[PDB]
DNA sequence: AACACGCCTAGACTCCTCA
DNA sequence: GAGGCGTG
DNA sequence: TTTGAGGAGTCTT
């Protein structure tokens, strides 16, 4: 089986064995999946090749697949019988036949049918052919017959069966996505990936019925379209699309299904239509801000912050952003102070957005403009250091240069991993708690790299006594214990796809063992507590470098900065917090 | 010099059709 | 979201 | 005529 079919069969098996997910398919749709498994390998191979391509008519001219068969005529015929794949005889709409033809093929057609401009562009010829065929039905039937003859043998994928596989992938996709935005990396690799072993346990339903899923899926397409508009810098298209989404979401706000969604725990409530429209409303405030409609942007941010149902984790980003627009763009210092107060009060705002609001506070208590207002009332200081480059040493990064400085300054051993180094160690020390039994709805299918609550407050609370026991054990751990825990997870789990664990991060198991030994129990314990407590807001801002001396076991955690980049809020909080745990932290600056 | 802010980024590549 | 570049 | 920017396709055993 080649990579594309391997990946497809994994996706299918994973979703079908899920009884509760299969409630969202009528018995005919389940029949189409049964029909696919009754196909030959070559039938399956070819269908997947066409499934991955644009939903459009394809000339058998253009269909080459050496690894399937030399001629695909019997393979197409199997898929035709099964009802997966139309042929010439089904191609009847004139618009569709004209699209399928080449510019020279339409030119010679336009000569025979005496069009006004036979040397015109394809679309003009197509629009012209459609006008003629409409006006004079008799001619239209000749155009259709003439076009189909030039078109030759061609084939299209049936939208009915396609839609069943689209929905299977949509259900499969939910659990692969840890962050917000078949996909390429999975299409290629998914067949070969071995996943952590855990116990699937589904107490709760995500979608009420088939109609609920279709409305989710539609909002997903709308979210996808809005992002693509913003990506291509078509900010007017995006505004209307976001306005359509706001209308479509407004129409739906009464529907009974939404009341079941409100009752889902946050780690499942992400997989609900209302969450997707809320995320579209986050994209809307982004578009309004780019079009300099800051009054309009602030209404939507106030609207979003007025509820706690959908995207609580985004509230930190919303408050910080509301404070900015009221302060710098609208110049309303009285709302700014209220916004910041309500912001800093809210226990959903964390780390960078917490600090950023507090930094905007100390900028107003020490500002002549806000003397007419009341009193209006931190981070620890860190050793900054400077070195020099030309960058070359031949061509090197800012981090590679700093590593050589720490190598010359005695630290023979070093890793430039940013957040992956502590994330992997966190994954390696707490694997068995990460994938532990007895939390319902967190393991729903066989291809998860994480429990669905990992990036939620639920993760720590749901595992509170087990984590506290391990966190304390790690704090009081001799190097023999740390080396043994890392070794246990390594030898049992090496290669297993876990979101937290980059297996290639450490050059060997020995390097992982050597590093935890230098870091020590108290440091590792505190890092693991933070990442377990609130991965969503503590994942980012860990320092670029760990450097350590292989004899002394002196180590520095270093955030490398080039000429023009300051500490982010999340970086300076991590430096302070690693200093409190009693590790030497440094900002290694670089200059020309 | 520093700092706060807006803005853009989005995989890497082949091949071939047609403005 | 995070990072890189340009602006005042 | 002559051509190259953009879109569809492809990627891992
Ligand atoms: Ca690090
Ligand atoms: Ca850096
Ligand atoms: Cl991006």
Author numbering: 372 to 509, 519 to 561, 571 to 766, 773 to 785, 797 to 799, 810 to 1008
Task: Reproduce, without paraphrasing, sentences from the article in which this PDB structure was first reported.
FAN1 (FANCD2-FANCI-associated nuclease 1) is a DNA structure-dependent nuclease ubiquitously expressed in the central nervous system and peripheral tissues that plays a role in resolving interstrand crosslinks at replication forks. It possesses both 5′ flap endonuclease and 5′-3′ exonuclease activities, allowing it to process DNA structures that arise during replication stress and repair pathways. FAN1 comprises a DNA-binding SAF-A/B, Acinus and PIAS (SAP) domain, a tetratricopeptide repeat (TPR) domain that mediates dimerization and protein-protein interactions, a virus-type replication-repair nuclease module (VRR) containing the catalytic site, and an unstructured N-terminal region. PCNA is a homotrimeric ring-shaped DNA clamp that encircles double-stranded DNA after being loaded by replication factor C (RFC).
